[PDB]
Amino acid sequence: AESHWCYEVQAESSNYPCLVPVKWGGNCQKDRQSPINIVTTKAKVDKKLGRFFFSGYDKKQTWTVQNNGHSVMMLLENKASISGGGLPAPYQAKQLHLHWSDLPYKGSEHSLDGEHFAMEMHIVHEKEKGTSDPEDEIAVLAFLVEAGTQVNEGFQPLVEALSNIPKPEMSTTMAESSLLDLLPKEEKLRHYFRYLGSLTTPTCDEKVVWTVFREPIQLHREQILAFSQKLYYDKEQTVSMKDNVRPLQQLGQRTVIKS
Numbered sequence: 001a002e003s004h005w006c007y008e009v010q011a012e013s014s015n016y017p018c019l020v021p022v023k024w025g026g027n028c029q030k031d032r033q034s035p036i037n038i039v040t041t042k043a044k045v046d047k048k049l050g051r052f053f054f055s056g057y058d059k060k061q062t063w064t065v066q067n068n069g070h071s072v073m074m075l076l077e078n079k080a081s082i083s084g085g086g087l088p089a090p091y092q093a094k095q096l097h098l099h100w101s102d103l104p105y106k107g108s109e110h111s112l113d114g115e116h117f118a119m120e121m122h123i124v125h126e127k128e129k130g131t132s133d134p135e136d137e138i139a140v141l142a143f144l145v146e147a148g149t150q151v152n153e154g155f156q157p158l159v160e161a162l163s164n165i166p167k168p169e170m171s172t173t174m175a176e177s178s179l180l181d182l183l184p185k186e187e188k189l190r191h192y193f194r195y196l197g198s199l200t201t202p203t204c205d206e207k208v209v210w211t212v213f214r215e216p217i218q219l220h221r222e223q224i225l226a227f228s229q230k231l232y233y234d235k236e237q238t239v240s241m242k243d244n245v246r247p248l249q250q251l252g253q254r255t256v257i258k259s
């Protein structure tokens with residue numbers, strides 16, 4: 001640890017030294033890492049990957065959202081959970097965050113068939129374990145965001161909040177909203193890809209069961225741009241928050257499956 005981890009854009013846009021992704025520590029240099037490219041036609045169908053059950057996702061709340069220095073993060077505080085989805089247990093929702101750029105063809109961490117989307121939203125959940133840490137301790141739901149001209153009304157509480165948390169360690173309260181307001185129609189979430197991997201920031205622990213849904217969220221270009229326009233990596237506000245994306249990792253001998 002000669003300096004704090006950063007994204008490539010941070011090193012490029014500031015003179016202050018920081019560790020770019022290819023130099024990250026902890027478990028980041030191991031071999032079941034994320035994100036990956038998914039060749040959709042090569043992922044095998046597994047019949048056991050059934051529909052998800054969301055609990056607490058329809059409920060209107062006033063979520064707390066904060067700039068943690070490398071993303072914007074809603075604190076979910078177990079107020080929601082998931083089961084199904086071919087998962088081994090229910091998982092409790094901890095936080096929701098995003099990764100983005102300011103060009104429509106980049107911003108996502110994963111790629112489908114070599115295409116990056118304009119953003120990627122991660123909902124982070126924790127395993128309800130039994131008595132017998134594991135490979136699937138964390139379930140992250142990943143949604144790709146496609147830029148367009150459709151105004152997503154569901155996103156507007158989040159987008160309006162961004163103005164209030166431009167600097168790291170700032171928090172605010174969003175207007176009344178549900179998690180489903182942020183997602184595609186539930187019927188469209190039957191198609192997803194599944195693999196085992198890591199967290200995409202240090203320490204990059206290899207304890208994540210990944211789900212990447214095929215159906216993108218549609219967001220207006222300018223709702224996407226609001227992220228890089230309103231947020232900063234630093235209190236000095238010298239580097240607009242964008243390209244908070246880990247580069248693609250090698251699948252190696254792992255297998256990707258789909259519903």
Ligand SMILES: NCc1ccc(S(N)(=O)=O)cc1
Pocket residue numbers: 122124140198199200201
């Ligand atoms: N702060 C721990 C943490 C949680 C979630 C991720 S991610 N990008 O979903 O893989 C990374 C780090």
Ligand SMILES: [Zn+2]
Pocket residue numbers: 097098099122200
């Ligand atoms: Zn993430």
